Symmetry: C3
Amino acid sequence: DDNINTLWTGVNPTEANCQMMDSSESNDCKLILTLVKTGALVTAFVYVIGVSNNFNMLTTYRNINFTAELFFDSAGNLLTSLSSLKTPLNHKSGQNMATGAITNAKSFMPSTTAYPFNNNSRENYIYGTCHYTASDHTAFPIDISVMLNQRAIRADTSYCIRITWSWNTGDAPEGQTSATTLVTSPFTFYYIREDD
Amino acid sequence: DDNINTLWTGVNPTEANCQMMDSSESNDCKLILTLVKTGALVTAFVYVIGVSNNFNMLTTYRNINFTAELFFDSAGNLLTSLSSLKTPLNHKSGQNMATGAITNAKSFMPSTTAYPFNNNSRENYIYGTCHYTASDHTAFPIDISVMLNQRAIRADTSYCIRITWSWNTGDAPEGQTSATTLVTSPFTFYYIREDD
Amino acid sequence: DDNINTLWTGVNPTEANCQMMDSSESNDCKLILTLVKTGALVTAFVYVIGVSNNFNMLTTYRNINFTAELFFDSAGNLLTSLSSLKTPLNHKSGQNMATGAITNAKSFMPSTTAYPFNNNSRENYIYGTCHYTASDHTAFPIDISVMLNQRAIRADTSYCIRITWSWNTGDAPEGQTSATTLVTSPFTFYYIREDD
């Protein structure tokens, strides 16, 4: 069964499943996250679809960054209370999430052996790029940094994935006319996965 | 059988399988394309090998862009008449194309759930970069755009993939005298795929 | 068995497995390399973790380049005497290398059909980017070149893979004092895989 090789958020959820900004009253966006086991690695594919106004209007600032923090327990279960993503992940079931248990969730996690915790003498950072398309159809470039693991906030935080989208320009992607909706193009990164 | 997880053009076809330029009267290049299923995603691997003289000589201009348009039917069979690629895809058979029927061709296609159709409703694409190597061995950078399912053109056009290669420079990558075959380095992008 | 689809160095070997610099008297770094079969392609995942002082002190210079040269025989076995990597690859066994024989090693190799030997205006180099993280956590960008096949050196050198990391900047990545071990973020590239 190939569907269990995916651990994902589902494609275009009915409602916003992610609270990117602390200032928001509830989930302010749709986080689309797909994790695929591909040999010794995880293929990670992620992007964002703006939902709440204050989030979407971030396009109007010249200097912006927002982070999705995803925290997992010892079994590879998403800790919804601590994480930016507020609905747990599941296997592929069409364009949707399956509803049953997760098979070998742990082997979707970033290797603690390759990406350790609280080790000043090693690094866990992954850097990439993605884009936003403005109303004027110009490709606005978005920086993406990825930090794996690192310090664990809670006693049960056994694995970490943090994704920061940032940008810096003399000009803002968008005006105050608004009537614009923020969406990042997809970013794909790769990491080594933990065993069961 | 792993061979059915790939849908491609085959490696290095005898002669040009793609008519990239509107001005060409026939196939003017070899479009090398690999679509590999990787769980809920498709890994897409693409580059071009110039054949016709007029096509190879694009290296001599300061402002150049070319697009391969791929249209697919409801079963996911390439609509060759409408497409730049004039030869259908089939599974991996060694370094070449297999000759039988295609297994689950639709599950290679870009998801209409993730990528619905824009018929004047919206506007969008996905961005990357690749390079050309000049006779002086210097890496000339080429921009790549990818548009999924933006617009359906004929009644049987169930899926769209458009890929545009462009560059803009004060100098042309090759001189009039230093003119050789146009070849791109491979570009990889990823999309969420439709189900069977 | 999914483990045989992976061919790697293992995670964080106890001792340096790679001699990057010719000036080094023994292995001066840890080469982390993972090759995963992905249909008709191989997903190649590579980065380095510095070990020797001479190698770690590379962080203090403004213009640096180093290359890992990998040569394989007709059976797809790494030729250690010739290669920068001095320890053979094996399949996944947890966070480590398998110890037995290698299953279908040749199919992890770069296609001679796609990437021929010393053939003019044919096949191509691969260019990419990755990063080094300085003490202030600022991302220093590293250019990567990848060369497939191309020139063989010894009579049993049936396959070739070269990886060049280079950089050129107005400032050195680290200060003289704040310098620490040199570690690259992972670079992921793709090639068409030779068959069995």
